[PDB]
Amino acid sequence: LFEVAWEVANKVGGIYTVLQTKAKVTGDEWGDNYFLVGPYTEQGVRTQVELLEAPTPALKRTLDSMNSKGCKVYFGRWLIEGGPLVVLLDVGASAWALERWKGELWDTCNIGVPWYDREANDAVLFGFLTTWFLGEFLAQSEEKPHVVAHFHEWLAGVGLCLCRARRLPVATIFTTHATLLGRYLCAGAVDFYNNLENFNVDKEAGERQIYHRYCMERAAAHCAHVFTTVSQITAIEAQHLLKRKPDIVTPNGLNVKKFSAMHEFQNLHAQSKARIQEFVRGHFYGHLDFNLDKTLYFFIAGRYEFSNKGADVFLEALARLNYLLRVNGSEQTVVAFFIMPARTNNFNVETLKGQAVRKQLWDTANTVKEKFGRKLYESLLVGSLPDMNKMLDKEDFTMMKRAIFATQRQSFPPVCTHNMLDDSSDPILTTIRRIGLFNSSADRVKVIFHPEFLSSTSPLLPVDYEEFVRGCHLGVFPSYYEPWGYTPAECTVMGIPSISTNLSGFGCFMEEHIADPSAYGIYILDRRFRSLDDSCSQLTSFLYSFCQQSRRQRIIQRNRTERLSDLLDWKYLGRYYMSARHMALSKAFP
Amino acid sequence: LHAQSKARIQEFVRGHFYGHLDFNLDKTLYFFIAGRYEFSNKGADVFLEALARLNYLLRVNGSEQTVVAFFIMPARTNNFNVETLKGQAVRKQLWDTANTVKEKFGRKLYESLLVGSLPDMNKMLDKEDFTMMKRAIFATQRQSFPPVCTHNMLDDSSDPILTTIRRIGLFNSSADRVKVIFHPEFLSSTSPLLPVDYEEFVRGCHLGVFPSYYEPWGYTPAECTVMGIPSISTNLSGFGCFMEEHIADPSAYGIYILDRRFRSLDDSCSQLTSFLYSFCQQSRRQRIIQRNRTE
Amino acid sequence: LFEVAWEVANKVGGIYTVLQTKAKVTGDEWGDNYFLVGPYTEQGVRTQVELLEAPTPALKRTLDSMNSKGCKVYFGRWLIEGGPLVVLLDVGASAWALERWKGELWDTCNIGVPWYDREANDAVLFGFLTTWFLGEFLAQSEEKPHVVAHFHEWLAGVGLCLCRARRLPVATIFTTHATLLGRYLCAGAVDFYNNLENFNVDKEAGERQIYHRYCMERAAAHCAHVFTTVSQITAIEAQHLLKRKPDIVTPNGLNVKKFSAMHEFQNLHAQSKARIQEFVRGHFYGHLDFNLDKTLYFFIAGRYEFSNKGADVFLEALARLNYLLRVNGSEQTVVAFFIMPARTNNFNVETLKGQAVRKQLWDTANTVKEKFGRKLYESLLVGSLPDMNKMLDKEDFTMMKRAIFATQRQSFPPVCTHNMLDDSSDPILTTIRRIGLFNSSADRVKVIFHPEFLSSTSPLLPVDYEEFVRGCHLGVFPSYYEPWGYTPAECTVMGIPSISTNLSGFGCFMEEHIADPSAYGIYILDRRFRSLDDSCSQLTSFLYSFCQQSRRQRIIQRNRTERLSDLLDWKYLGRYYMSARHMALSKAFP
Numbered sequence A, C: 001l002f003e004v005a006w007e008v009a010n011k012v013g014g015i016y017t018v019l020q021t022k023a024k025v026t027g028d029e030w031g032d033n034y035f036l037v038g039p040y041t042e043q044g045v046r047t048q049v050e051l052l053e054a055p056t057p058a059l060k061r062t063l064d065s066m067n068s069k070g071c072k073v074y075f076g077r078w079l080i081e082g083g084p085l086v087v088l089l090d091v092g093a094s095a096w097a098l099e100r101w102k103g104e105l106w107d108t109c110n111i112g113v114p115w116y117d118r119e120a121n122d123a124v125l126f127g128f129l130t131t132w133f134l135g136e137f138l139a140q141s142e143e144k145p146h147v148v149a150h151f152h153e154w155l156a157g158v159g160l161c162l163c164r165a166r167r168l169p170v171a172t173i174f175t176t177h178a179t180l181l182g183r184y185l186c187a188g189a190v191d192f193y194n195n196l197e198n199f200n201v202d203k204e205a206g207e208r209q210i211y212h213r214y215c216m217e218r219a220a221a222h223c224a225h226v227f228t229t230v231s232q233i234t235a236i237e238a239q240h241l242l243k244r245k246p247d248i249v250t251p252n253g254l255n256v257k258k259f260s261a262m263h264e265f266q267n268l269h270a271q272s273k274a275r276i277q278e279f280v281r282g283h284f285y286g287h288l289d290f291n292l293d294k295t296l297y298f299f300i301a302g303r304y305e306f307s308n309k310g311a312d313v314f315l316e317a318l319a320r321l322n323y324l325l326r327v328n329g330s331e332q333t334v335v336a337f338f339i340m341p342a343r344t345n346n347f348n349v350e351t352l353k354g355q356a357v358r359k360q361l362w363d364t365a366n367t368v369k370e371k372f373g374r375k376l377y378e379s380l381l382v383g384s385l386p387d388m389n390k391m392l393d394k395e396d397f398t399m400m401k402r403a404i405f406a407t408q409r410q411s412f413p414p415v416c417t418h419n420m421l422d423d424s425s426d427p428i429l430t431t432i433r434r435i436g437l438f439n440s441s442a443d444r445v446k447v448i449f450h451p452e453f454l455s456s457t458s459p460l461l462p463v464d465y466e467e468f469v470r471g472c473h474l475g476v477f478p479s480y481y482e483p484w485g486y487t488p489a490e491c492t493v494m495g496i497p498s499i500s501t502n503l504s505g506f507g508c509f510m511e512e513h514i515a516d517p518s519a520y521g522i523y524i525l526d527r528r529f530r531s532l533d534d535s536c537s538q539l540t541s542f543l544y545s546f547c548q549q550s551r552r553q554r555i556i557q558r559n560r561t562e563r564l565s566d567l568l569d570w571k572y573l574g575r576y577y578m579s580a581r582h583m584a585l586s587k588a589f590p
Numbered sequence B: 001l002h003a004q005s006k007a008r009i010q011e012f013v014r015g016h017f018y019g020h021l022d023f024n025l026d027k028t029l030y031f032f033i034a035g036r037y038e039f040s041n042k043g044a045d046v047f048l049e050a051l052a053r054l055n056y057l058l059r060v061n062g063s064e065q066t067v068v069a070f071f072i073m074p075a076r077t078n079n080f081n082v083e084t085l086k087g088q089a090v091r092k093q094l095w096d097t098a099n100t101v102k103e104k105f106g107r108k109l110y111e112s113l114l115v116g117s118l119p120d121m122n123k124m125l126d127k128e129d130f131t132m133m134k135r136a137i138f139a140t141q142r143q144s145f146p147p148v149c150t151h152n153m154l155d156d157s158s159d160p161i162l163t164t165i166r167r168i169g170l171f172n173s174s175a176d177r178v179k180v181i182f183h184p185e186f187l188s189s190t191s192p193l194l195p196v197d198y199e200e201f202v203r204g205c206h207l208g209v210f211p212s213y214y215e216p217w218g219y220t221p222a223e224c225t226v227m228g229i230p231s232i233s234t235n236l237s238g239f240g241c242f243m244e245e246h247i248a249d250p251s252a253y254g255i256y257i258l259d260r261r262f263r264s265l266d267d268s269c270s271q272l273t274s275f276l277y278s279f280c281q282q283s284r285r286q287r288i289i290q291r292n293r294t295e
């Protein structure tokens, strides 16, 4: 098996997660005949990969057959023990002969990549290197086994045509997880779901680009022995646009972390929410005028797509929910996070300063705490109950007064934790300042935009993504166009209720698998049969309905949402890959 | 008190010089010049010239000693800069990561001691904690040099201190034997960074250099000597004049009286450099004895 | 060099400390030609010794020359890096032929050991083994060097006669640190210092025993090329009783631990006194009616000799000082420790229970402390100064009341921390209950008898001896008969003022080395020209005078006492051993 892809060592939301979750089961069920191919980027990928430059059995012949011939191929383990013997390929090591590879592409399939975008050039170069490695392996192994080559996305789709030109006896499977042409039309301010058969692919390809990419994608789909897509909705645009109906639907699964107790995810949520509460206390210093027990943490994560990931409708719903909470005289407050990576330069002074003063207050309270504890210990040793007024003197009251005065703040807490280099052109900040949300005292919702992926080694918010998601209360992902949707998937795996859409692969998958959804925390939101304003109103209604329920109802809802983890497990969802491999073997050679 | 305050200053230095802790901290001496922001009156130009010269001698002498010189002179700022707060944040993030590995190691060691078997030291730490230590080490990697000013001043092109610092080529580099930290604000016990009031910080330093040209009496050296810290006064100062005829043979009690009346500016700078180097050469025992004599 | 002795691996107050302190300088000045010989006891001595059974250079010939011949010889390092290549000898391994060794002793010097005491039989067996090892080494080394053999005490004195019988060409030095006959006459309720020339050695030897021991000691003194003693007072009884005037006086030194700062011993004293204060709070639970800042810690340590170490006079002085402190209306209190090992079975329930309730109160105060700190942190985060009455609720007051009630105690704290198996015959407890000292509320002095050596791994008092001594305030050692005195020596080395005697080697040594003593914390107490009652009165006066001075005076006195460490340093006191070695070399062979 060869699961060649571009995201194996570099962290990107797509491809990387599905491969990392699949590797364990796909290796334990099959064995050491599982091989993974990907690129090399000088970004720290070697930190997570245990490279094996020295010769190693289980395809030891290529190391002394081709490595010392002007190429660069490594063998790694990934630090994940699913037996993922990964074949890492360097991109910049072999780039001096791009002209001959372009000529080879011209001879074979009249395709290639223009010099405008280096991403696709690197993808094609990696495809050439992968094809050379696979051919060398077949030559060295005397063609005794019939290996199956599987391809993900267009970043590794040139392998299909390269192998078909050379007629290598392998079973070809191609699985596209996102028709990028659909992605770039859905961002073109044009309706995409009302009609699909009225699109002219060649006319649209090129004004927004995606002409060579579309051509190579369709060539791979046609020439691949087995074609596959993520959701049933994915197959719909695949057969209507690429004119190649997928052989079988292959829903995306996850490696659920089973605990010895059913309620351990609740404890993880409690701890992570405590950490988020510490961050909130840091950010809203001098403005802690709202109860923190009535605070709910909403969030929308993923790549920074405004109209595709559904951030405009979420912000409109947040403004409306703020208006209803203000006019209803409610003590509930909602802190909404926005984890969408936009380029910054560093943090702003306000956020780091807020964390600093929060922990300075923590230190001052600690000091008074040890002094009080020592005096109380003396009193208990003597045998007299404290009268509570003889312990604290004038100096510690003086320093508490000084600390309180130092934390006084007149400006409002910032909406962005980082210092972005383009604030006049950022959609999120623009609409935030348009809808009049500035974390004010009167505001019932507080927006925090964290334009960066979460990491466990960050100066502020020392939580990785999974822990932070476990800490939140509701994940709102009203995405207009996205094939499957991972973020709601692990939200429901970790027990957090989520707001999906009927235009999403996750929402569609959970639509017909459960009778009466939204009773299990899956607030499916209709975006196909409703206008934008109606969808915003429905999102506001869903948010308010989540707000009105008490703590017991929230706990019960989280339990019900967690109970659905078995649907997205790779044990249940891995059978489709096995079926695809069986069809590929039957088509190529029994 | 000096030991505790120097420990706090060491924590601040570790925060500021994160990813650049290539110098021994036991060979680090903390000089400072405090008071109101007068350049030619409080003697900040001559101090910076002497700092540059002492850096040159320490570099050409192959010395392991390093000197961190503080400049507490209030100039109007707007807030801190991102680099300094970020440095404190990553320092205490490393502290938290080391703490986490520390509790895990302590629990495993407690289990081993309860069983009755001496640790073999390789069965305790697994792959995950090594992974997070590697990630923490990578996160603290830094390519830019530590800043010379902890705050964000609104006029850097017209500040005398920063101008002469960038003129004398001092940027807290790895090769630099002296590191300059300009803190344009009075110290306070309730500050987000450096949570020390002025007296505690002065107790933590090693030598207070106040080569003031014109000032009537001089308080800063007075409480420096009251708290035991050796000081460098001048014969144009009221404190220096007062201590001149009250003690036979000064500079044997930590009062490095510096002549600025009968000497030119260059000669005064050379004498200040000689005094700084002489303070640098003496060992820990000599420093302790000198602090006792000054107290 | 061969510093053969019985206390090299087993912990005994004498011999062990002097050898362990000397080894560093005597090895750094000379080198790897330094060899140490001692016995083997199955008591954990191998834990502190890195045995080298495998062959090792620097006398590698004996390992393959004699070890595989029915004997048992090891090579060790001691874990002390003074280069102490120690030659460890097993005692029980070679004991099957004691009859032939007894016959050899009869042939050589008409000496030996009767079967009443196994200590001296083991000593003689170890002496035979040492002589065999030394002879084998000379045979293997072709007698190229002229090694010097030095002997300590009568536990290794048979080596002198054994080597003299065989006429081995070595330079013999013998250093007796205690004339044991003097020790056992001074405990016989007979005056010993008024006259020395009127004693009949043979008549006294045997009724109290020490006949064979005395004979072999005097034979070693006569036959040794160089004879040496600890103090000038030691030489006095040596020449008047053994009839062999020592060649030179060899005062006992110590390896002083120099710190980078002069005042570090003050900080060590502060920390150790804090630990002793924790122990006192544990022991006196429910009876902490006295200020702990006015508490002074006196102690008398060493082996359990009542009339020789001066414990009766110390207890009489403690009772008198208690009477004066009571009638003077003083707030000062004195806790007097008695570290004298007597056999026990385990601790008593009261002391362990007291430590337990002390740390239970510590835990309860801690719990209230975290609750208070969290509430205070919330208040400071809000921005409001605490009003100090809204934080503590009824439950934590309830548990503080319950804890206070649980620590109520009606019986007085015990005087002995352990459970001794003979309380009706213990001199210390007998005189304590006679002088009416029971740690009462009215008592101004509190006596704690700890019948065991201090250790760092004890369930209570987790302090080794040096740390505890650093923590105390005054070491009272009014010893009647003891040759030199180590305990006051390291008391003054570590800065603690001490009360020595003019009958002591340390007191005599410090008498003529400093003008006007007792101005440096050395309270020399006259016991030769004064009666017992007068000595007790002088001790009471010294204790009261120490009590009256304030904290500043105590600190200054500790500084002055610490300044005298250079007198007892081995650098200054090691020249006498060098002189003795030079005389031995001159007498044996130039």
Ligand SMILES: O=c1ccn([C@@H]2O[C@H](COP(=O)(O)OP(=O)(O)O)[C@@H](O)[C@H]2O)c(=O)[nH]1
Binding pocket: A012, A013, A014, A015, A017, A301, A302, A303, A339, A452, A453, A454, A465, A482, A484, A485, A486, A487, A488
């Ligand atoms: O701060 C973040 C936010 C998102 N993700 C990852 O990004 C993926 C989102 O994938 P999705 O299919 O939702 O959309 P994509 O970002 O791939 O377009 C999830 O698997 C997350 O694990 C992350 O690692 N850190």
Ligand SMILES: O=c1ccn([C@@H]2O[C@H](COP(=O)(O)OP(=O)(O)O)[C@@H](O)[C@H]2O)c(=O)[nH]1
Binding pocket: B034, B035, B036, B072, B185, B186, B187, B198, B215, B217, B218, B219, B220, B221
């Ligand atoms: O960070 C600082 C620096 C200086 N000072 C005070 O400023 C005074 C300096 O007075 P001096 O006579 O040296 O000169 P002045 O500043 O009055 O001109 C000293 O007493 C210090 O206590 C302070 O409080 N904090």
Ligand SMILES: O=c1ccn([C@@H]2O[C@H](COP(=O)(O)OP(=O)(O)O)[C@@H](O)[C@H]2O)c(=O)[nH]1
Binding pocket: C012, C013, C014, C015, C017, C301, C302, C303, C339, C452, C453, C454, C465, C482, C484, C485, C486, C487, C488
């Ligand atoms: O709790 C104790 C008490 C005493 N000692 C040691 O016992 C020795 C006392 O020797 P000294 O010459 O005072 O009298 P000895 O006990 O040898 O007769 C000192 O060196 C101490 O180090 C000890 O290790 N722990």
Ligand SMILES: O=P(O)(O)OC[C@@H]1O[C@@H](O)[C@H](O)[C@H](O)[C@H]1O
Binding pocket: A266, A267, A268, A269, A270, A271, A273, A473, A551, A554, A555
């Ligand atoms: O954050 P909430 O919705 O109020 O949930 C409250 C918390 O949920 C879970 O983490 C646990 O059951 C906690 O015990 C509970 O306090």
Ligand SMILES: O=P(O)(O)OC[C@@H]1O[C@@H](O)[C@H](O)[C@H](O)[C@H]1O
Binding pocket: B001, B002, B003, B004, B006, B206, B284, B287, B288, C261, C264
């Ligand atoms: O900072 P230094 O000059 O090296 O002084 C070293 C320190 O001085 C004092 O604070 C104390 O004596 C400390 O015990 C000592 O370690």
Ligand SMILES: O=P(O)(O)OC[C@@H]1O[C@@H](O)[C@H](O)[C@H](O)[C@H]1O
Binding pocket: C266, C267, C268, C269, C270, C271, C273, C473, C551, C554, C555
């Ligand atoms: O126990 P005392 O005799 O009262 O001595 C008091 C203590 O002595 C030394 O340990 C130190 O100087 C301490 O700073 C001091 O508090």
Ligand SMILES: OC[C@H]1O[C@H](O)[C@H](O)[C@@H](O)[C@@H]1O
Binding pocket: A013, A014, A015, A177, A178, A230, A252, A482, A483, A484, A485, A486
């Ligand atoms: O369909 C699988 C997932 O990965 C894809 O590459 C897309 O980035 C994401 O939107 C999709 O949900």
Ligand SMILES: OC[C@H]1O[C@H](O)[C@H](O)[C@@H](O)[C@@H]1O
Binding pocket: B215, B216, B217, B218, B219
């Ligand atoms: O002379 C007394 C002190 O206070 C004065 O006001 C000056 O500011 C200062 O330089 C002087 O040393």
Ligand SMILES: OC[C@H]1O[C@H](O)[C@H](O)[C@@H](O)[C@@H]1O
Binding pocket: C013, C014, C015, C177, C178, C230, C252, C482, C483, C484, C485, C486
């Ligand atoms: O004289 C040296 C020291 O060790 C001796 O063996 C005695 O036990 C002790 O009292 C003496 O002070």
